[PDB]
């Protein structure tokens, strides 16, 4: 209450197959954008001058409507089980049968959802199902 | 057909070099100034040929080469207005006996205010100095 310090008092809990699907969509979108964008203009660092104070959020920033984020365009048919919710800040956090509650600690999906998340996750998912792949390239062989 | 055209060209070339101030000052004088300057430079170079061994013979050949594009550009009326008018007034001064000093001063207007341009301009200075040498000797 003296204003000395502000802590962010929350934990970013995520559903791991959803988080993998979100980052895979982000990955595909960024790849497509690097391909398509003729000239990618990078930022300059530090973004603000050494002699300029940090901006007042309420005066300069709060009134501006944000720009569109990186969202890959999902199919209305072939992504139908995830299209409504994949890009929420806490996906399914209000769906009482998919998630335990707004404390966001346990999740339970159906087969159509898990299939859609697996299909979206193709860049960032593992695909080595064969356990013999890691012969002499695993934890204990590295130990030896 | 081309040698016959050369014959009628040389037939025109023998008929004079004396420049007129009003024609220097006129836009419609473009063909007359170009042809007259060409003929006068040919007369200078001819008198150098007549006096070749007396005055820098090794440089006359390179001077003829360097003055080739100016004479072609004159022959086709392709000189820009400033170059033609400054050259015409240079040669006008050069035709009088006392005005040799002003011809080289007007050459400074011509030359000071590409590589081929620079070559033929410095060759005009070479012509001026040959004229000075001859007239002082004669």
């Amino acid at each position: 209450t003296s204003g000395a310090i502000t802590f962010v008092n929350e934990t970013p809990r995520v559903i791991e197959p959803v988080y993998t699907a979100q980052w895979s969509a982000t990955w595909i979108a960024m790849r497509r954008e690097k391909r398509d964008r003729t000239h990618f203009k990078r930022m300059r660092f530090p973004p603000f001058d050494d002699d300029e104070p940090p901006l007042s959020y309420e005066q300069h920033i709060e009134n501006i409507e944000p720009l569109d984020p990186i969202n890959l365009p999902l199919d209305s048919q072939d992504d139908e089980y995830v299209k409504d919710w994949l890009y929420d800040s806490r996906p399914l956090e209000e769906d009482s049968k998919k998630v335990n509650g707004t404390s966001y600690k346990k999740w339970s999906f159906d087969l159509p959802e898990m299939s859609n998340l697996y299909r979206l996750s193709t860049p960032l998912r593992d695909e080595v199902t064969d356990k013999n792949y890691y012969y002499l390239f695993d934890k204990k062989s590295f130990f030896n | 057909n081309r040698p016959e055209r050369i014959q009628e060209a040389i037939a025109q070339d023998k008929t004079s070099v004396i420049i007129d101030p009003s024609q220097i000052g006129s836009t419609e004088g473009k063909p007359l100034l170009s042809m007259k300057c060409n003929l006068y430079i040919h007369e200078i170079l001819s008198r150098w040929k007549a006096s070749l061994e007396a005055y820098h013979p090794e440089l006359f050949l390179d001077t003829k080469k360097a003055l080739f594009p100016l004479l072609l550009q004159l022959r086709r009326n392709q000189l820009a207005p400033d170059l033609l008018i400054s050259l015409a007034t240079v040669l006008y001064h050069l035709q009088q006996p006392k005005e040799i000093n002003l011809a080289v001063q007007s050459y400074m207007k011509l030359s000071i205010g590409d590589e081929r341009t620079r070559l033929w301009i410095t060759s005009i200075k070479r012509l001026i100095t040959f004229e000075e040498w001859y007239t002082s000797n004669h």
Binding site: - | H56, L59, N101, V104, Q105, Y107, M108, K109, S111, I112, I121, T122, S123, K125, R126, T129
Partner: protein, 241 residues
């Protein structure tokens, strides 16, 4: 890099070529880098001109004198606040062939200064730019083998502008020759005074004396007259006229 319209790109090409060759601040940078690196360039230094060797001026090597003293000139008045101050007036470069008496007199007009700072530097650099352009206007046989500068402050700016011409030596002199007194010659003074824009005027300063005396004698006569004009202008004119 950027948006070119017609005629701009050749101009900026020529501009950047000359600026990179001969801008004075980039020269200061190069000389400091050379000093910090302690690198020196070998050359054959031509000797000085003096009263023991100046007879060599009149042999068949073509030569030119250069004097910058009258390039920057002023006149003086007193201001309303009681202070004293200058105003610029028209000037010149004196460039003389001592064998023939041909004078090339480039007039430096007051419009050249554009109210800029540190004009006494800019004068020396402008002098070298006009001298090197004058040399470039002459054909190869008529370009000199040596150029003699009356004031040593010209040697660095002129050498920089003359790097295009590897065969040409630039020489200093021990003789404090009186060529600044050229602006005491009445006709040259009038010619510089009346000018409304930059131009170069050409003369022979030996006035056909070469028909009856040698170039050595003509140079002696010219230097004697100019020495007197520098010494006491009124008395010297009052002898001549």
């Amino acid at each position: 890099y950027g948006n070119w319209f017609n005629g701009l790109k050749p101009l900026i090409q020529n501009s950047m070529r000359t600026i990179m060759k001969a801008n004075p601040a980039l020269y200061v940078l190069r000389e400091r880098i050379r000093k910090g690196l302690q690198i020196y360039q070998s050359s054959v230094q031509e000797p000085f001109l003096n009263s023991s060797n100046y007879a060599e001026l009149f042999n068949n090597d073509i030569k030119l004198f250069v004097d910058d003293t009258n390039v920057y000139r002023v006149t003086v008045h007193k201001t309303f606040e009681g202070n004293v101050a200058t105003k610029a007036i028209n000037g010149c470069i004196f460039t003389l062939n001592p064998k023939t008496g041909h004078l090339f007199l480039k007039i430096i007009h007051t419009s050249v200064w554009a109210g800029q700072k540190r004009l006494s530097q800019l004068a020396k650099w402008k002098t070298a730019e006009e001298v090197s352009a004058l040399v470039r206007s002459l054909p190869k046989e008529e370009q000199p083998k040596q150029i003699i500068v009356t004031r040593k402050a010209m040697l660095d700016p002129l050498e920089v502008h003359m790097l295009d011409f590897p065969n040409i030596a630039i020489r200093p002199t021990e003789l404090r020759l009186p060529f600044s007194a050229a602006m005491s010659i009445d006709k040259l003074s009038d010619v510089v005074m009346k000018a409304t824009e930059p131009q170069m005027v050409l003369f022979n300063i030996y006035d056909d004396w070469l028909d009856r005396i040698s170039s050595y004698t003509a140079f002696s006569r010219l230097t004697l007259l100019l020495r007197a004009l520098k010494t006491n202008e009124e008395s010297a004119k009052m002898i001549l006229l």
